[PDB]
Amino acid sequence: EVQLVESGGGVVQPGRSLRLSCAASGFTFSSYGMHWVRQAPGKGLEWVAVISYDGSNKYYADSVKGRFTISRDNSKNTLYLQMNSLRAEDTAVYYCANGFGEYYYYAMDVWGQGTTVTVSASTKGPSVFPLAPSSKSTSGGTAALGCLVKDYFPEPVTVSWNSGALTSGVHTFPAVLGLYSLSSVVTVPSSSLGTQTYICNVNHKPSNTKVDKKVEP
Amino acid sequence: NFMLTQPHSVSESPGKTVTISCTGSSGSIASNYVQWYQRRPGSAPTTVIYEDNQRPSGVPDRFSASIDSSSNSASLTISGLKTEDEADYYCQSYDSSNWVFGGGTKLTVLQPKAAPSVTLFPPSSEELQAATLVCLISDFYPGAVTVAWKADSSPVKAGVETTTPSKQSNNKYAASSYLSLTPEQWKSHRSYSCQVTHEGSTVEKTVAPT
Amino acid sequence: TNLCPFGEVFNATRFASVYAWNRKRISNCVADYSVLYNSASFSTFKCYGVSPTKLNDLCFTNVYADSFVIRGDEVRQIAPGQTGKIADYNYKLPDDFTGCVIAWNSNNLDSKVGGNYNYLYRLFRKSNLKPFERDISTEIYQAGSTPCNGVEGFNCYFPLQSYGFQPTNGVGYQPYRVVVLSFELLHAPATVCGPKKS
Ligand SMILES: *[C@@H]1O[C@H](CO[C@@H]2O[C@@H](C)[C@@H](O)[C@@H](O)[C@@H]2O)[C@@H](O[C@@H]2O[C@H](CO)[C@@H](O[C@@H]3O[C@H](CO)[C@@H](O)[C@H](O)[C@@H]3O)[C@H](O)[C@H]2NC(C)=O)[C@H](O)[C@H]1NC(C)=O
């Protein structure tokens, strides 16, 4: 049972340093080459580095060339990735993998379950900005309308109207750093003739700052 | 540097066969061994093909791979499609001191197909008081959408994007994307379009902001 | 230390011209293969009829190491079933090849500013080489219907032509050092074994 269990940091400040560990069990670690591979949320797989069974051969992806530094300790059955000068684009699940067959490492064989490294920060609540509507009803009667919630940490900011309108196509948030924001859409097929009022009730949580705005065309 | 480029998405019906392509650029794909890795949603990657066209023990013979040096491409082929095959598929090799992964191809085992509907409008003049734009997408299957944000008619890198989640019991998908902008570009060109490409049929899917 | 001399095949100072490709028989030794472990120092690495990850637990009657220099866009021809000037007239691998092909860019060794012209290849031949055949003769090649009488001229060509390896060539025209290991299994005891069944 070849097993790789990465252990290491999670949330870290940009410009700091973090030390990943990979614990190998179920095979002669000293005779295999090891890879580091990351997968930022939403993005695909990207190779970090590789180290020979000896430690004598080390190669790095260009995007980590100087900051990151691979190493191993065959007595401790452990692979290490030293990443100093951490930047925000290095936020990913970090996988550790062994090379196919002994010694050779042109391919990866067994992968670990990864550790998620988040680089960022301070707990704070958001503001809210209205989205103004448009329609120009041409036998369609489709007037899309909503609100925004910018720079909120963390989930789950509640958004609705607390009333009878139950036709809101609410959405989710892109966790990026480079914003954190929500949105929701509401539809009024009459294209309200300056009459129907749409309050947009938006409560926070990590700052206790519920806010509301009125969407005026 | 040597590059591996895969299609963003592909999809077929259960029992059918699909083929994921992996075409190299700035180097020959046939030079070094090509691997194929499978990553199920949320899981860790697993190996499915090694050394161009070998299967590890446990990988069903439904999985096959080959090289085509004429087109400079490797091709994974999965027969008798099953819902368990739904995953991101990454081809991999190396050029000298650099190990390269393809961008990855999300495979969706076909529920009906539905093109997405797009909404965009950033009139939060309360935000111009201190502006980030909004391009909303909803009700699409399969869940793989690629959106290009074009300042005037030229792309931007300030564009942020979500991970295409599944909206509740609809089983379809809906994503959102935002970008930080200056008033100038939306005034500059007649539009400030935001275009969505879903399946082979991406007729429009782009609103004209200002 | 009856260790097989594979590293000396790879780190040799001088490499043969492809038309006179060098063959070193490897016998009666324990196979190292550690030079193959560093895939990053090679431009192409492929085995045939065997996986590289199995070499350390296998035994063979003989190993032959063939080595030579060719230019970049010609390395694809060092593979079973290929055609071209190298595969037809210089070095031909059999269809049932069992072994590995290794090559790397050697521009920093085999190209000179005025152009290196010491590396030759055969341009013409009355017929294709059979697998693992070598042809070092220099008879004038009769390209037309009129015979040559050992004299060069129009349609009467010296059969060896010279590479022009200049450090500023494109990689397809830069020199590449190639090593071809073929693993031979006869109905006789093995003399070369990996370190895991010595
Ligand atoms: C050409 O290559 C030979 C063979 O050694 C090779 O070294 C690597 C570069 C790979 O190509 C391998 O496939 C292969 O083993 C060189 O000769 C040998 O070099 C090694 C390392 O320098 C020597 O090993 C050492 O042995 C001593 C005790 O003998 C130990 O203390 C060391 O820890 C180490 O294990 C080996 O003895 C040596 N063999 C001989 C016969 O000299 C050779 O130097 C090289 N030539 C050039 C010009 O680079």
Residue numbers in the entry:
A (entry chain C): 1 to 52, 52A, 53 to 82, 82A, 82B, 82C, 83 to 100, 100A, ...
B (entry chain D): 2 to 27, 27A, 27B, 28 to 66, 66A, 66B, 67 to 106, 106A, ...
C (entry chain A): 333 to 530
Can you list sentences taken from the study reporting this PDB entry?
Crystal structures of the RBD-Fab complexes were determined for FP-12A, IS-9A and IY-2A for characterizing their footprints on RBD. For FP-12A, the footprint is focused on the N-terminal half of the linker (residues 369–377), like that of 3D1128 and S2A4. On the other hand, antibody FP-12A is a weaker neutralizer compared to 3D1128, although their binding modes almost overlap when superimposed. Their detailed structural differences include the Tyr-rich HCDR3 of FP-12A which slightly pushes away the α2 helix, a weaker engagement with the 372–375 region, as well as other residue differences in LCDR1 and 3. On the other hand, the substitution of A372 to T in all sarbecoviruses other than SARS-CoV-2 may have a substantial effect on the FP-12A/RBD interaction, as RBD residue A372 is tightly packed between the HCDR2 and LCDR3 of FP-12 and there is no space for the side chain of a threonine. It should also be noted that three mutational hotspots (S371L/F, S373P, and S375F) are in the C-terminal half of the lower region (residues 369–377), which could have a larger influence on the activity of FP-12A, IS-9A and similar antibodies than the EY-6A-like antibodies. FP-12A, IV-10C, and IY-2A share the gene usage of Vλ6-57 germline. The conserved S30NY32 motif (Kabat numbering) in CDR1 and E50D51 motif in CDR2 participate in an extensive hydrogen-bond network with the 376–380 strand and 384–388 helix of RBD. FP-12A showed a one-way pattern of competition with EY-6A but blocked the interaction between ACE2 and RBD. IV-10C and FP-12A only showed binding to SARS-CoV-2 RBD.
